[PDB]
Design an enzyme around this catalytic site. Structure first.
Site, mmCIF file in Angstrom:
data_model
loop_
_atom_site.group_PDB
_atom_site.id
_atom_site.type_symbol
_atom_site.label_atom_id
_atom_site.label_comp_id
_atom_site.label_asym_id
_atom_site.label_seq_id
_atom_site.Cartn_x
_atom_site.Cartn_y
_atom_site.Cartn_z
ATOM 1 N N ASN A 36 0.829 -1.223 0.000
ATOM 2 C CA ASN A 36 0.000 0.000 0.000
ATOM 3 C C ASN A 36 0.874 1.290 0.000
ATOM 4 O OD1 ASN A 36 0.929 0.019 2.571
ATOM 5 N ND2 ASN A 36 -0.977 -0.691 3.595
ATOM 6 N N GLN A 89 -4.173 2.748 19.033
ATOM 7 C CA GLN A 89 -5.318 2.634 18.083
ATOM 8 C C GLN A 89 -6.194 1.422 18.471
ATOM 9 O OE1 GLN A 89 -3.095 4.511 14.088
ATOM 10 N NE2 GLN A 89 -3.832 2.375 14.024
HETATM 11 N N1 LIG Z 1 -0.490 4.975 7.396
HETATM 12 C C1 LIG Z 1 -0.451 3.795 6.740
HETATM 13 O O1 LIG Z 1 -1.504 3.282 6.319
HETATM 14 C C2 LIG Z 1 0.879 3.137 6.471
HETATM 15 C C3 LIG Z 1 1.004 2.214 5.413
HETATM 16 C C4 LIG Z 1 2.235 1.621 5.154
HETATM 17 C C5 LIG Z 1 3.329 1.968 5.953
HETATM 18 N N2 LIG Z 1 3.207 2.829 6.959
HETATM 19 C C6 LIG Z 1 4.383 3.144 7.812
HETATM 20 O O2 LIG Z 1 5.414 3.669 6.961
HETATM 21 C C7 LIG Z 1 6.675 3.001 7.247
HETATM 22 C C8 LIG Z 1 7.620 3.083 6.066
HETATM 23 O O3 LIG Z 1 7.133 2.309 4.962
HETATM 24 P P1 LIG Z 1 8.047 2.026 3.686
HETATM 25 O O4 LIG Z 1 7.376 1.067 2.707
HETATM 26 O O5 LIG Z 1 8.508 3.385 3.118
HETATM 27 O O6 LIG Z 1 9.283 1.365 4.512
HETATM 28 P P2 LIG Z 1 10.797 1.118 3.959
HETATM 29 O O7 LIG Z 1 11.393 -0.003 4.733
HETATM 30 O O8 LIG Z 1 10.939 0.945 2.523
HETATM 31 O O9 LIG Z 1 11.561 2.499 4.326
HETATM 32 C C9 LIG Z 1 11.981 2.736 5.678
HETATM 33 C C10 LIG Z 1 13.108 3.786 5.635
HETATM 34 O O10 LIG Z 1 13.435 4.224 6.964
HETATM 35 C C11 LIG Z 1 14.868 4.373 7.075
HETATM 36 N N3 LIG Z 1 15.209 4.377 8.499
HETATM 37 C C12 LIG Z 1 14.925 3.452 9.467
HETATM 38 N N4 LIG Z 1 15.374 3.879 10.623
HETATM 39 C C13 LIG Z 1 15.968 5.084 10.431
HETATM 40 C C14 LIG Z 1 16.641 6.014 11.248
HETATM 41 N N5 LIG Z 1 16.828 5.761 12.579
HETATM 42 N N6 LIG Z 1 17.111 7.150 10.717
HETATM 43 C C15 LIG Z 1 16.974 7.410 9.428
HETATM 44 N N7 LIG Z 1 16.354 6.558 8.609
HETATM 45 C C16 LIG Z 1 15.851 5.409 9.087
HETATM 46 C C17 LIG Z 1 15.419 3.236 6.212
HETATM 47 O O11 LIG Z 1 16.690 3.455 5.630
HETATM 48 C C18 LIG Z 1 14.398 3.150 5.069
HETATM 49 O O12 LIG Z 1 14.863 3.764 3.854
HETATM 50 C C19 LIG Z 1 6.272 1.563 7.644
HETATM 51 O O13 LIG Z 1 7.252 0.914 8.447
HETATM 52 C C20 LIG Z 1 4.946 1.807 8.400
HETATM 53 O O14 LIG Z 1 5.145 1.929 9.819
HETATM 54 C C21 LIG Z 1 2.021 3.416 7.223
#
Ligand SMILES: NC(=O)c1ccc[n+]([C@@H]2O[C@H](COP(=O)([O-])OP(=O)(O)OC[C@H]3O[C@@H](n4cnc5c(N)ncnc54)[C@H](O)[C@@H]3O)[C@@H](O)[C@H]2O)c1
Ligand SMILES: NC(=O)c1ccc[n+]([C@@H]2O[C@H](COP(=O)([O-])OP(=O)(O)OC[C@H]3O[C@@H](n4cnc5c(N)ncnc54)[C@H](O)[C@@H]3O)[C@@H](O)[C@H]2O)c1
Lengths: 351, 351
Positions: B119, B286
């Site tokens: 998503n 939540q």
């Molecule tokens: N609101 C929603 O419906 C919804 C849907 C999907 C995901 N999300 C949230 O969004 C997050 C990210 O999703 P994604 O597909 O982009 O994940 P992803 O794994 O592709 O990207 C995560 C990024 O965070 C970086 N990161 C992690 N820890 C870090 C830190 N301490 N400092 C700097 N950078 C850091 C990583 O390098 C990475 O590039 C998910 O883990 C989830 O919690 C929310």
């Protein structure tokens, strides 16, 4: 050589001083009072525009120039034009001059001009915002939040991604083109209708496909966006019959002019579910009365008339208004694209 | 070798049937019940998740697989993992597995997987819609409409165009990249911070610039977007001191996770005007209780947790959950990018 200049703007009260560039309200009056008065002109500014006894009407018999603004529009009727013995120039601080009787202005020999291009980016942004708000169902989530509720299913059952959907813009002038450009990276199927085809290379960059006959585009669209002026031809064009041709559950965005839609036709088709949602900032009339039914119909995502009067838009249309006034005092023509009525002729996009 | 499978989803009641593809609710349960029962397995589905006495807690002692979903998250605490004698597999229907105690899961040898990429477009869209809503001040306009008011100044003093503003995404993984690609045609000054820099060709296409030190990027930004997982390092990272490094009047969008922000530190800086507005779909905890203060603070543009659960998203995460169940039953590995905890080890983006 000294002229009487009247401006009709929205009143800000305590909001007037919260941003230093808030040029669009009564109190700040486009930033031009000092510049006007230093040249010996009289400048009268008011928001009081309705009826026989308002301040505007006091000054109609002898003003030379009337500066109006679409967000709080002075309705310059045939009767007002006949009363206005010294009037020569009607300037619109913004875009869209339909709040003037343009046929009676042409018949009287008045010049009508507006600041073309000044807030077109601003409206294209706001349109893309509202497409997203209707598709992704933001409003019912916000309402749950403020009422202290929590029911994801009540929102999710009709929430969709914009990716892959078919979007049609009815009109592809300055605003419609800027909207198509911003929609390109969302990965939609883009269509457009206009009397005028876009250049080949602009079609190729945006991926948007010309549909010459409007009636052929309508049934295909999940989303329809209004992007034409309010003209004799567009007025009331979205009536009972035309709205029946739209896809069942169509989402409509209209930041153009409210009167392009028939008011009650929209209400009936929203209540039946044939229009799935309607969002815009423009109404007939403005200010919209407290009982205006678009405020209360299911699924509405309306605001008052704000998209062309962001602070950044205000700076540009105040500057354009000042430039035209300066040209007017010197007997110089305005940029050609600014004229709506000149030498008794209406500009082509209004014909 | 027939298993007890438990699903915890949000309950839809009458909403369930309104869309044939409404797979994310309790009633439709990812569409997999017949598929699972035909293979001899049992499938217990519930929304009742809180405390010692709820329906979930009755099945904790003997379940083999627990399917959870971020929009209505089962909190799989250390005490719960301990009571779960049969549990081998924790599947997240959606993205982000922080509602699990991941340290206790690692300690117990449990596998934790989710539907990576399912998503990510949906959230990127919803983020960009929120930047616009905050920048262009949509919410006060909506509020005036429903209360029967009309006051353009009360909205316009604070409304700006997105064009020319500086926007920083904190995190540039899947969602952050998709956001940057959609921001490109708006004509902004785009910056990003991550532990990992993007490919030079992606930096070039988007026009986004890497800022290696987070503290350097932060005061520069008109808009901040949160785009990392909730991890031991990100949890509570936006505290009193870090919010203080932000530009006065900063607009913040957070569709990542609520607990990345300290709850009261956001309330205080919003009340002071240091944060100019805050918008997101995610909360700690939540469902968000009736009295959660983010519902009521000035300028808030919140919704319940919806953006990763559009109909189009649900189709993709339902399919990915089914595919991992099939692999599971056959003893086959999941796609590598799906694993959050495998063999007692956390994935690199959570470290
Ligand atoms: N609101 C929603 O419906 C919804 C849907 C999907 C995901 N999300 C949230 O969004 C997050 C990210 O999703 P994604 O597909 O982009 O994940 P992803 O794994 O592709 O990207 C995560 C990024 O965070 C970086 N990161 C992690 N820890 C870090 C830190 N301490 N400092 C700097 N950078 C850091 C990583 O390098 C990475 O590039 C998910 O883990 C989830 O919690 C929310
Ligand atoms: N909400 C706001 O704040 C705001 C701000 C600016 C403009 N507007 C409205 O949007 C309108 C369009 O602005 P613009 O800069 O894109 O105008 P534009 O003149 O550049 O484009 C108008 C287009 O409409 C087409 N057209 C006219 N009549 C038509 C017809 N009968 N059938 C099909 N096509 C027809 C023209 O060919 C032209 O391409 C303005 O006239 C104004 O009314 C609203």
């Amino acid at each position: 050589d000294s002229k009487k200049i009247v401006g009709v703007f929205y009143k800000a009260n305590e909001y007037a001083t919260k941003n230093p560039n808030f040029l669009g309200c009564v109190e700040n009056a486009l930033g031009i009072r000092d510049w006007l008065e230093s040249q010996g002109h009289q400048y009268i500014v008011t928001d009081d525009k309705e009826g026989p006894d308002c301040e505007l009407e006091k000054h109609i018999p002898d003003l030379h120039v009337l500066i109006s603004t679409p967000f709080h529009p002075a309705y310059v009727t045939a009767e007002r034009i006949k009363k206005a013995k010294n009037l020569k120039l009607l300037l619109t601080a913004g875009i869209g001059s339909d709040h003037i009787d343009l046929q009676a202005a042409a018949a009287a020999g008045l010049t009508v001009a507006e600041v073309t291009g000044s807030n077109v980016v601003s409206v294209a942004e706001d349109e893309l915002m509202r497409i997203l708000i209707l598709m992704r169902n933001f409003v019912p989530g916000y309402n749950q939040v403020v009422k202290g509720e929590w029911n994801v299913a009540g929102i999710a059952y009709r929430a969709y991604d914009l990716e892959g959907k078919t979007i049609g813009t009815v009109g592809a002038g300055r605003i419609g083109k800027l909207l198509l450009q911003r929609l390109k990276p969302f990965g939609c199927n883009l269509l457009y209708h206009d009397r005028l085809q876009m250049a080949p290379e602009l079609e190729k960059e945006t991926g948007a496909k010309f549909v010459e006959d409007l009636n052929e585009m309508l049934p295909k669209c999940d989303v329809i966006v209004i992007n034409m002026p309010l003209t004799e031809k567009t007025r009331g064009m979205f009536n009972k019959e035309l709205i029946g041709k739209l896809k069942k559950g169509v989402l409509i965005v209209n930041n153009a002019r409210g009167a392009i839609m028939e008011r009650q036709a929209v209400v009936d088709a929203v209540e039946s579910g044939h229009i799935g949602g309607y969002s815009g900032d423009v109404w007939d009339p403005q200010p919209a009365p407290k009982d205006h039914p678009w405020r209360y119909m299911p699924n509405q995502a309306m605001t008052p008339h704000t998209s062309g009067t962001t602070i950044d838009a205000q700076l540009r249309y105040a500057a354009g208004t000042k430039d035209m006034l300066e040209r007017y005092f010197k007997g110089e023509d305005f940029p050609t694209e600014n004229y709506i009525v000149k030498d008794g002729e209406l500009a082509p996009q209004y014909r």
